[PDB]
Amino acid sequence: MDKFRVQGPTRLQGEVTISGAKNAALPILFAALLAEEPVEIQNVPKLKDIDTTMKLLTQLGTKVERXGSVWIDASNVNNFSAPYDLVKTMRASIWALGPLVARFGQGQVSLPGGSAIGARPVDLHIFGLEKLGAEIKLEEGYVKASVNGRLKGAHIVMDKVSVGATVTIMSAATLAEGTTIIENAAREPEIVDTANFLVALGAKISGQGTDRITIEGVERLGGGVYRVLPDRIETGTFLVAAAISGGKIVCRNAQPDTLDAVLAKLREAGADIETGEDWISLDMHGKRPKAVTVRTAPHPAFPTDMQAQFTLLNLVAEGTGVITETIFENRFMHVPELIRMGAHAEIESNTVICHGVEKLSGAQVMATDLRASASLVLAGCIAEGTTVVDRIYHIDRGYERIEDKLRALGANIERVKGE
Amino acid sequence: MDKFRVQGPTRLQGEVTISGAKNAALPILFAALLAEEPVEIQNVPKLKDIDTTMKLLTQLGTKVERXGSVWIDASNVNNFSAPYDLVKTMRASIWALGPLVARFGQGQVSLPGGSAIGARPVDLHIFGLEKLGAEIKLEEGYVKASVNGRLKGAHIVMDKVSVGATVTIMSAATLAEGTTIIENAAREPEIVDTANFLVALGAKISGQGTDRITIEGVERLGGGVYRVLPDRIETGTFLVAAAISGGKIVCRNAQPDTLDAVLAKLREAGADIETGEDWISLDMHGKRPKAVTVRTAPHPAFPTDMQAQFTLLNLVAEGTGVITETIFENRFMHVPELIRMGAHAEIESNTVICHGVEKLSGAQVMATDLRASASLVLAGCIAEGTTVVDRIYHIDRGYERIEDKLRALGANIERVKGE
Amino acid sequence: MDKFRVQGPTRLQGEVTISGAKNAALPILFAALLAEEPVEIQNVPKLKDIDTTMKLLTQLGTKVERXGSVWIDASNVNNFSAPYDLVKTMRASIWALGPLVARFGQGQVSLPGGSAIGARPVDLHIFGLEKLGAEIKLEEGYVKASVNGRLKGAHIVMDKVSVGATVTIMSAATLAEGTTIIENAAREPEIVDTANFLVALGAKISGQGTDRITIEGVERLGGGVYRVLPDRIETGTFLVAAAISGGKIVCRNAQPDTLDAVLAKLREAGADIETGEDWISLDMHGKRPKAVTVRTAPHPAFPTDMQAQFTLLNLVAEGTGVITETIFENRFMHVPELIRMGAHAEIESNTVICHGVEKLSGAQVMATDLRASASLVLAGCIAEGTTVVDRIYHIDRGYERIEDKLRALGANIERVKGE
Amino acid sequence: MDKFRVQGPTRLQGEVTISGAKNAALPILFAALLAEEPVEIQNVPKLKDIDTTMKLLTQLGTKVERXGSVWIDASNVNNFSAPYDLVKTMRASIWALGPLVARFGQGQVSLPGGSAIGARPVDLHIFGLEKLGAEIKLEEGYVKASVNGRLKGAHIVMDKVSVGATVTIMSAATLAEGTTIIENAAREPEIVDTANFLVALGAKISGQGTDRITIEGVERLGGGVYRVLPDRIETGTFLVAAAISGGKIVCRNAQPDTLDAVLAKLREAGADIETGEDWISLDMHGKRPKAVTVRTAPHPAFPTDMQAQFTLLNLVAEGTGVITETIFENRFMHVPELIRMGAHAEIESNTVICHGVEKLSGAQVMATDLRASASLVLAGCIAEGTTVVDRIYHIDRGYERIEDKLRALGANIERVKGE
Ligand SMILES: C=C(O[C@H]1[C@H](O)[C@@H](CO)O[C@H](OP(=O)(O)OP(=O)(O)OC[C@H]2O[C@@H](n3ccc(=O)[nH]c3=O)[C@H](O)[C@@H]2O)[C@@H]1NC(C)=O)C(=O)O
Ligand SMILES: C=C(O[C@H]1[C@H](O)[C@@H](CO)O[C@H](OP(=O)(O)OP(=O)(O)OC[C@H]2O[C@@H](n3ccc(=O)[nH]c3=O)[C@H](O)[C@@H]2O)[C@@H]1NC(C)=O)C(=O)O
Ligand SMILES: C=C(O[C@H]1[C@H](O)[C@@H](CO)O[C@H](OP(=O)(O)OP(=O)(O)OC[C@H]2O[C@@H](n3ccc(=O)[nH]c3=O)[C@H](O)[C@@H]2O)[C@@H]1NC(C)=O)C(=O)O
Ligand SMILES: C=C(O[C@H]1[C@H](O)[C@@H](CO)O[C@H](OP(=O)(O)OP(=O)(O)OC[C@H]2O[C@@H](n3ccc(=O)[nH]c3=O)[C@H](O)[C@@H]2O)[C@@H]1NC(C)=O)C(=O)O
Secondary structure (H helix, E strand, C coil): CEEEEEEEECCCEEEEEEECCHHHHHHHHHHHHHHHEEEEEEECCCCHHHHHHHHHHHHCEEEEEEECCCECCCCCCCCCEEEEHCCCCCHHHHHHHHHHHHHCCCCEEEEECCEEECCCCCCHHHHHHCCCCCCCEECEEEEEECCCCCCCCEEECCCCCCCCHHHHHHHHHHHCCCEEEEEECCCCCHHHHHHHHHHHCCCCEEEEEEEEEEEECCCEECCEEEEEEEEEHHHHHHHHHCCCCCCEEEEECCCCCHCCHHHHHHHCCCEEEECCCCCCECCCCCCCCECCCCEEEECCCHHHHHHHHHHHHHHCCCCCCEEEEECCCCCCCHHHHHHHHCEEEECCCCEEEEEEECCCCCCEECCCHHHHHHHHHHHHHHEEEEEEEEEEHHHHCCCHHHHHHHHHHCCCEECCCCC | CCCCEEECCCEEEEEECCEEEEHHHHHHHHHHHECCCCCCEEEECCCCHHHHHHHHHCHHHHHHHEECCCEEEEECCCCCEEEEHHHHCCCCHHHHHHHHHHCCCCCEEECCCCCCCCCCCHHHHHHHHHHHHCEEEEEEEEEEEECCCCCECCEEECCCCCCCHHHHHHHHHCCCCCEEECCCCCCCCHHHHHHHHHHHCCCECCCCCCCEEEHHHHHHEEEEEEEECCCHHHHHHHHHHHCCCCCEEECCCCCHHHHHHHHHHHCCCEEEECCCEEEEEEECCCCECCCEEEEEECCCCCHHHCCCCCCCCHCCCCCCCEEECCCCCCCHHHHHHHCCCCCCCECCCCCCEECCCCCCEEEECCCCHHHHHHHHHHHHHCCCCEEEECCCHHHCCCCCHHHHHHHHCCEEEEECCCC | CEEEEEEECCCCEEEEECCCCHHHHHHHHHHHHECCEEEEEEEECHHHHHHHHHHHHHHHCEEEEEEEEEEECCCCCCCCCEEEEHHHHHHHHHHHHHHHHHCCCEEEEEEECEECCCCCCCCHHHCCCCCCCCCCEEEEEEEEEECCCEEECCCEEECCCCCCHHHHHHHHHHHCCEEEEECCCCCCCCHHHHHHHHCCCCCCCCCEECCEEEEEECCCCCCCEECCCHHHHHHHHHHHHHHCCCEEEEEECHHHHHHHHHHHHHCCCCEEEEEEECCCEEEEEECEEEECEECCCCCCCEHHHHHHHHHHHHHHHCCEEEEEECCCCCCCCHHHHHCCCCCCCEEEEEEEEECCCCCCCEEEEEEHHHHHHHHHHHHHCEEEEEEEEEEEEEHHCCCCCCHHEEEEHCCCCECCCCC | CCCEEEECCCCCCCEECCCCCCCHHHHHHHHHEEEEEEEEEEEECHHHHHHHHHHHHHHHHCEEEECCCCCEEECCCCCCCECCCHHHCHHHHHHHHHHHHHHCCCCEECCCCCEECCCCHHHHHHHHHHCCCEEECCCCCEEEEEEECCCCCCEEEEECCCCHHHHHHHHCCCCCCCCEEEEEHHHHHHHHHHHHHHHHHHEEEEEEEECEEECCCCCCCCCCCEEEEECHHHHHHHHHHHHHHHCEEEEEEECCCCCCCHHHHHHEEEEEEEEEEEEEECCCCCCCCCCEEEEECCCCCCCCHHHHHHHHHHHHEEEEEEECCCCCCCCCCHHHHHHHHCCEEEEECEEEEEEEECECCCCEECCCCHHHHHHHHHHHHEEEEEEEECCHHHHHCCCCCCHHHCCCCEEEEEEECCC
């Protein structure tokens, strides 16, 4: 069991080049199951979930290889199932269902169980596919979708704003018979990116980025080349790294308009921010951050994927900060760990009341989930002494060589084994 | 203290002509304060809040008169305060602050207190105005806004989706210097309608209806004519009226695209729905409704203003219905009253678990707020016997002579005094 | 519509003699319906609810008269129903059901509708009576109970801790055949007082004050004399009055052991407290209170009836105070009103985050419920200038001559009309 | 990674002998650190946490050994710290802090991090120890307690009911100077058992079992023998086993009065229950269970440790069952897993709405915590086909060879490896 040994404090400054978005690459890779012709996806980060995805696709009969790009040839998909073994390691596997039933009339994916940050049901994915004409049956833990011929467009109103269900329904609808409308669709940048990818293959989609998406089905989708957009969560993570360590940083290969909420909050924390077409610079001028109030919600509001990072920022900020999480019911696992490092906080239902302290103390902590692990590593960077973050494999799920990029910013970090 | 005597059951059927939206006419009436020339607002419903608004505007030195339209001449606005006496009867008065400070550099409005359905703070309106350059102070219960010269455009990210704050900021921004961007803005049809009204006066606005509104300030706004859009909640209320009484109805002067969530839910309840350019028909074919699941949220999701009405529908429906209110913290006051009529429900935090019964029993109940009073009246129409709904003055706030429109559908309803 | 016009600031100091507990007097007065012989209840406060109760009792055929005591003669009961008109003014009327069905085999009470501070169902009262053998029906909004002969003892486990339901079940059980056991009973001081009252009439009760109450039914209860214990909420209210005005007070005719949580919280706020056998003294030594954290819960935890008062204390205290209400879902109505007076707070689900300020500003505010009204009045006492608390009739429901007692502490208060 | 392969459906019937309470043995074993003379604890179950506890004690310089009993000689404790590597595997280790600082004036325990079912802070333990005079510092993740001389009795009011904090405070108070009073103490049967154990060593404690515990400190505690009470949760687990499989079972070595809430709920589910002095019999007479409503809360209310089990019972019961969890914020992890087996449920905040189905389908599921793992195993016993419960090491924490006991009841179970 790998761990990260961090010695602080250290001001983090310099530059970092943002990788392609984990959450755009994933839905795109699955959307590729719709392509009857070779597809090249560019700027795909090297993450654990990308590997698991390539594995799942290959197991479906797809020809896959990668480097900076991932080349896909799904012309001969001949297997339509995602076994429990793979699904249990990556719930995103659920995104295989829509494309498979939409193009081949069938698909079986193991129903994901519970997740670290919440129950995370997939009822909206199922609801959507059923509205498109698919028949869904659950047997032996497998959601089994089927349709005789082509799915049929339908006007669907979402009971909840869901990034995942939006991707599933929008993706399957591209090969449906007629027009599909997704009312109360997720507006996240990754939805836009996945939509534009599908359109690149020959799909007809409009409204991506708004509350209502309109898809006009076609008989088939071809191939092509598409470059994934910048990872806004990675970008925010590094901006937070500078913001909490009195440093300065410039993020290259970034897309500023995907982060208005985060940037505005960073400015309120006292950060001096400047943005360009493809870059963002943040300078704390050696100042300690000011406490801010945050409420997560669907894009363009403050993103839940930056919540643990801002929880850390408030814990070392001057003043009382309040963090309200409205997306996932169990996403405060980093709090108890930060408390071990000397932080002061109280959890009241889905809100964390933070009382910032001058400095944290190095201690042994445990990563419980992707964003939580990144926060613990950042905490280790600014804490006094040695911090050992156990189970950092979590971090390898959504950050490409975070270790090197942090070191390049002045961090004293070492990856160690010792199970 | 007026009351409503309703005798049932009665299958409600026929037609109704939807009035102009209460929640579009109000923000527009206040936005009119920005007009330097005569303005005519058409299709304005005759509601208690419209009367209070006319008095408030008059008290600001505005010349006001009405019938179907409301004619406004705010060329000579010479007073800039909204007193506690008026604000305490209508919190919407808060909408006078932005236009006043934007056009005259000053404005004072009594800070609204607690509301029946929630604390409903206005911190976001104040925040927005401050971001536009206004200096805000609270003294003696009055929020006093001021700015030296014109307000200045700014990029504002909303910590919460707010219909009211969106109106305040968007309205004030039309006269600000430069460009204003509202990130995570409310998307309600009434926001769209208010934006279009401001545009008709000469304002420059785009993005209304999406989560990002862009306003380019101008030196001043003129006058003109604008017709308020159909009231979607009144429409939904009457559609429910037929849906729960096994009836049929046709709503005239309606705008179907403002009710996708509501219509979708009525179909799930078993309703046969048809829509035209400006009309909506619903036929229950004598059926008892089927229990549905609802979760209120910002437009285009299911609206909180239809929540009590659907709570009623589920309480007389087949099966177990679940209603989750995420907008207001005290909007279940109709439940205890419906329970007095034989309904079976349990409140669990912000969710109501409903167990539909065949028929309700007439009983004496108390209206506590606008939408709940409408639900109790509808309940009276379908319950067995006589139902007396006390304090129906609440209903005259958002419905234009509802007993008449209901009587034309076959309701045995009478307005009595007896304090 | 009476109001309290209060001039501040004024330090509150001196002495106050605590009246009998409103919440002990009420359940005992209803318990008296079980008495076949004359009963005298001493130390009964003069409150609106006592008058409504004496009114309801008289209406049942009981002979009632009062002064310091209330003399009851229920040897004859010629009517067994509590009308809607009365119940609507006092939900506590529900307590007439149990004694009536237990002694006469019949009784009916109008099902209470919604309450200002919550839905407050009475399902547990009904459940308990049904477990004791009563048949319950709901017709025309009335709860109708009946039993052929005597009720029979049962082992009942309460799904939730309820003061009211514990009173109903314990009271009815006294005339039941056999032994009754109430598991997970409320342990409030008033339950202990009502049990001791019943025992004085000849009932056999043990465990009152613990989570399991054992009642041994007897054929009939006689008469007697019983003194109601001191009102702990009135006591806490006056202690807070001193704590938030830098004052020093001595509460006479008090019972310290019923207020451990409150006293401990006041000490944490910086109050110097001393207690005797029947008195409590509190001295703030001119200090501003220190913010505290509070979580309401069943006795002996911090009581929800002191929640609004402590919210006020935190809003004028030094630091960040947190109030969490777990009993009633709508008991923060005082917050929006205090905010009108310059307080700073945010409500997050069932928790209020307070940011204490130096001085409040006098303003026009509205009382919404009993404890809230008392808090607004205290706020007026320490605020700068003139505060007008509308609808103070709410305060006359549970405070005997609060105006006089406050004036005797130095308050500049005046009860004015002017509707 | 061990797993359980279960084959269903198999009716569970027969007998089981209840082991000593896991949650009584643990606090007692730590309380033993106060004993200056040899102690023998009887009826201690063989569980993972007991082993970890013996390791921790041993490492403090304690002489420990076991079989049915555990013999402790803590006369020579020479080390006062519980390392991170031990506490990370068992947060109950926190219970070493109080005894150590109370008897030796010092002690340091690694502050526990996050837990599977919630953040579970220990702020109340620290608060209590500080009130007893201990100085608490946090450094490098270790909570360091110290006091010069002996702790001093104090009147402590818990602003939340905590089993753990109650144990910590009550344990340390036994050696304190003077009288300590714990207001709003936990009333769990294990608190009673731990208090009687301390009393057996020479401590002076009264009130155990009520919301107020009084402890009179003494100079030192001797040795002795004490038998741990029956495990009510294990008992409840096996009673549910029979109740959901239409079986009949008898639990030996049980203590009925510790399960009033659970038995009452089982009867409501249709179970025929009889109890003796030390046994409990439950017969379902081949009937399918009836859906019940549950709300966890401090003893004697329904226990949170039986919540997952009852979630299961409702998922295979007739009707709609509602489970509300008020103790831990993340204890619904079993729901997603049961859903994979064909169950129908929706999670609404802290409530689960269940829609019972006839039969579950065997599938691969994952144990997430102790009670959840037991629930999944039981589900496997009644499900149709093969069920594989991964990570059953969780079950070995609180159940002594559950495999054998279930098999003795007719279950087709087998522990397999295969990582
Ligand atoms: C957790 C991460 O990323 C997450 C990110 O937090 C969320 C929210 O923006 O959207 C993606 O998941 P997701 O698709 O499961 O998110 P959502 O579907 O939007 O879930 C939002 C809310 O809806 C609920 N939900 C979702 C689907 C459904 O059928 N039913 C349902 O009730 C969720 O359980 C939650 O209560 C990202 N993952 C990918 C692979 O695209 C991370 O990388 O750190
Ligand atoms: C209640 C009615 O209508 C309401 C309707 O329910 C709501 C929601 O769609 O939007 C209008 O009020 P509103 O402007 O106060 O609504 P919002 O601002 O959107 O409030 C939404 C949520 O944000 C909160 N909120 C709002 C403003 C602010 O500064 N801060 C804040 O925290 C609210 O208290 C609530 O928790 C309608 N009223 C008018 C006059 O336009 C009705 O007619 O029955
Ligand atoms: C509100 C006041 O006093 C109240 C005090 O707050 C509460 C709590 O201690 O106990 C008395 O009411 P109560 O009898 O209605 O209180 P409870 O029954 O204990 O209610 C507690 C919780 O249980 C719920 N509840 C109660 C009864 C029932 O059948 N079902 C149920 O769900 C409540 O709605 C609430 O969510 C006092 N009133 C009298 C007349 O004795 C006041 O005087 O200011
Ligand atoms: C989880 C198990 O058992 C648990 C059982 O659920 C709970 C509740 O009855 O009481 C014991 O834990 P515990 O001591 O941590 O329980 P509690 O202290 O009572 O916690 C109750 C509530 O108070 C909170 N809490 C507790 C202590 C504190 O200092 N602060 C605090 O906020 C908790 O996080 C929770 O929100 C049992 N464990 C042992 C080893 O005795 C199990 O065996 O499955």
